[PDB]
Design a protein around this nucleic acid. Structure first.
Ligand SMILES: [Mg+2]
Ligand SMILES: [Mg+2]
Ligand SMILES: [Mg+2]
Lengths: 383, 238
RNA sequence: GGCUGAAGGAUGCCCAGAAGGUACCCCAUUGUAUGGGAUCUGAUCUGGGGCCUCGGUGCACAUGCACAUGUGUAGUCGAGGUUAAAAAACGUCUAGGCC
């Protein structure tokens, strides 16, 4: 829930600056998430806020809006600190702030380890960015040598404190707070609500305002799931061809549990006029990101994946998921569909189920408590 | 009878497979389709138009696909001594989709009474969700139709005059949906429309919405898209 | 009862005219809206358009003797004229024509 009882409809009423609105709309934000709905106004006014929500789902975006609103544009200095559990997520959050501040004229930086110290000294001397992200240990190692200004900083921010507690830098943040001022705004957010973070609340942040965002993954009834009674493995590809011949497919996600079938079906489809992008279990993470973004853009209309890889990264702008082979991990089924974010407003699931896997269909239907209707012959109008 | 349905199946398969990169390899398949009856032609055009306005991202490819069938004559079933070119039929669908706005609010009005008739809170909320969902389905259509028309323009199946009387028609209806469509159309046709033969007329279009930009009477998001369009114009449409 | 195809229609192009549009301009009300005008158009209809004259090449013929000249022209390339218009020899239907 939220002890603060102002739940807002959209960004329009949030009384943002026009240039910040231009940045956020150029990014693409239309309707706030729960933390965006509620936890934005408290940090605009200047209150000190504790928050708990899912990471990467716009949770950082809320305080991005708030901080960039509070930042004074005229003064070229560092007015706020941000402390991330790692360095690469700090780079991502700096980039996403740039996505919401390209029209601001402000500046953000990402102080990260494994870098030349005097290079950072000169970069801070030439121009102090209005905000800085980083990790508590190297952030303190950077600040203590007076390479920044711990004076003008008026909003201290912790993100993923549970992860910082895992690193065991409680004394490190203790000293970082001891260095900064007294009456500055403080916001801390965490993935969960453990006892250590709650202890951190009463030590540094005064009069907490609590944001308790409820993570959810069950939207079973929103999305429809049909099955096709194809019994021969060789006829599975013909079944897929029929599906593409009788459906209005925008983009499709092909799930395959194993590895050999992935390349087998990839080559079979590439013989036909399809354009596909395929991911394997022996792949790296970088080229996986390349393939994921390539499919996201739309230059390819088929994404062949394996369940764990789709769990690692997902895109919900797809209107059709073919469960080509039902997963041995029954629970992973909900991950395979991906219903965790109401993605199935109009989304459909297709299970090309071999004969002996009708039993598998049965226990997923019962245990998950769903209803897998049979593929109608006249579904072209229903979808 | 089965021939028409089989042709529809193959056409929909081609449309689903159609992508900008793999374009050429499928085009042979398109030219090898036996479209020789007004019903088959009308159905194929219906499929193409529905796909192209319901999925703007790939519309480019579909637009170019239409160019491959700009000359496909067929005899009308009523009077078999007459012929209908594919272009005449595809454009009529586009124009009919373009001017539904005059009637569009009407159907919403025909449902607006139901908003009053849904007495209880549950019924009222469900009716409101359905009417806004319908409003989304329509706004998504109009935008797709506008982008498709703009894409057909770049392939010269249209001419500058139709764009110049479509932009002005969108702009005269100062409602939000029309201004969004205007932003989309100019964004997709600016480079191929910003010529010296149209320099005076164009010089008013943007100026007009500049007043809109300065009025701030509409929703912010509309102003924001109009600012994007104007800035893209300032940078020679790139 | 099956094969094929007329620049005879239809389609495309060009020209004329009409419905419709017309940001800007002008005129009226006068309210920034409607109506009219002026261009600019015309996703749509109604008509019209398959001209001449000269060369090159090729072809056939007829003469003289493989070669040359004359004649006609291949949906020929050009070069010019003429009418407001000089067209996709046409992802089409027929009248036929044949078995
Ligand atoms: Mg008129
Ligand atoms: Mg005519
Ligand atoms: Mg005639």
């Amino acid at each position: 829930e939220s002890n603060w009882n102002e739940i807002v409809d959209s960004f329009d009423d949030m009384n943002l600056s026009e240039s910040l609105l231009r940045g956020i709309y150029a990014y693409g934000f239309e309707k706030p998430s729960a933390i965006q709905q509620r936890a934005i106004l408290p940090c605009i006014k200047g209150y000190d806020v504790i928050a708990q929500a899912q990471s990467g789902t716009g949770k950082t975006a809320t305080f991005a809006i708030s901080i960039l609103q509070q930042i004074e544009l005229d003064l070229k200095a560092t007015q706020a600190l941000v402390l991330a559990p790692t360095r690469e997520l700090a780079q991502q959050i700096q980039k996403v702030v740039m996505a919401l501040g390209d029209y601001m004229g402000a500046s953000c930086h990402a102080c990260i380890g494994g870098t030349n110290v005097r290079a950072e000294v000169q970069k801070l001397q030439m121009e102090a960015p209005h905000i800085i992200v980083g990790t508590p240990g190297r952030v303190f190692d950077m600040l203590n040598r007076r390479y920044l200004s711990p004076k003008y900083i008026k909003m201290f921010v912790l993100d993923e404190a549970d992860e910082m507690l895992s690193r065991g830098f409680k004394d490190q943040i203790y000293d970082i707070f001891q260095k900064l001022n007294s009456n500055t705004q403080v916001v801390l957010l965490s993935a969960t609500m453990p006892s250590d973070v709650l202890e951190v609340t009463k030590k540094f942040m005064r009069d907490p305002i609590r944001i308790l965002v409820k993570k959810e993954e069950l939207t079973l009834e929103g999305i429809r799931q049909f099955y096709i009674n194809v019994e021969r493995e060789e006829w599975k590809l013909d079944t897929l061809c029929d599906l593409y011949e009788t459906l209005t497919i925008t983009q499709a996600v092909i799930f395959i549990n194993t590895r050999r079938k992935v390349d087998w079906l990839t080559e079979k489809m590439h013989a036909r006029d399809f354009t596909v992008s395929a991911m394997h279990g022996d792949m790296d993470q970088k080229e996986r990101d390349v393939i994921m973004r390539e499919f996201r853009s739309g230059s390819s209309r088929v994404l062949i994946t394996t369940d764990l890889l789709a769990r690692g990264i997902d895109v919900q702008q797809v209107s059709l998921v073919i469960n080509y082979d039902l997963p041995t991990n029954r629970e992973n089924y909900i991950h395979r569909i991906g219903r965790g974010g109401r993605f199935g407003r109009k989304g459909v699931a297709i299970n090309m189920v071999t004969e002996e896997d009708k039993r598998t269909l049965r226990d997923i239907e019962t245990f998950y408590n769903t209803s897998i209707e049979e593929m109608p012959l006249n579904v072209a109008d229903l979808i | 009878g089965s021939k028409t349905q089989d042709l529809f199946r193959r056409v929909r398969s081609i449309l689903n497979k159609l992508t900008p990169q793999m374009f050429q390899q499928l085009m042979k398949q398109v030219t090898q389709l036996a479209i020789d009856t007004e019903e088959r032609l009308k159905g194929v055009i219906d499929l193409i138009f529905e796909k192209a306005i319901s999925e703007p991202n790939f519309s480019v490819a579909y637009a170019n696909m239409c160019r491959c069938l700009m000359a496909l004559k067929v005899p009308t079933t009523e009077k078999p001594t007459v012929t209908v070119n594919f272009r005449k039929l595809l454009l009529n669908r586009c124009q009919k989709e373009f001017e539904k706005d005059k009637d569009d609010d009407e159907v919403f009005e025909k449902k607006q009474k139901e908003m009053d008739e849904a007495a209880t809170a549950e019924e009222r909320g469900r009716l409101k969700e359905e009417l806004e969902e319908a409003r989304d389905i329509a706004r998504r259509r109009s935008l797709g139709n506008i982008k498709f028309i703009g894409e057909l323009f770049k392939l010269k199946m249209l001419t500058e005059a139709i764009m110049h009387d479509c932009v002005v028609k969108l702009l005269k209806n100062h409602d939000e949906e029309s201004l969004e469509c205007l932003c989309r159309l100019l964004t997709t046709i600016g480079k191929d429309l910003d010529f010296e033969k149209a320099k005076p007329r164009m010089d008013q279009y943007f100026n007009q919405m500049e007043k809109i930009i300065k009025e701030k009477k509409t929703s912010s998001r509309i102003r924001f898209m109009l600012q994007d369009v104007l800035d893209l114009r300032g940078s020679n449409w790139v």
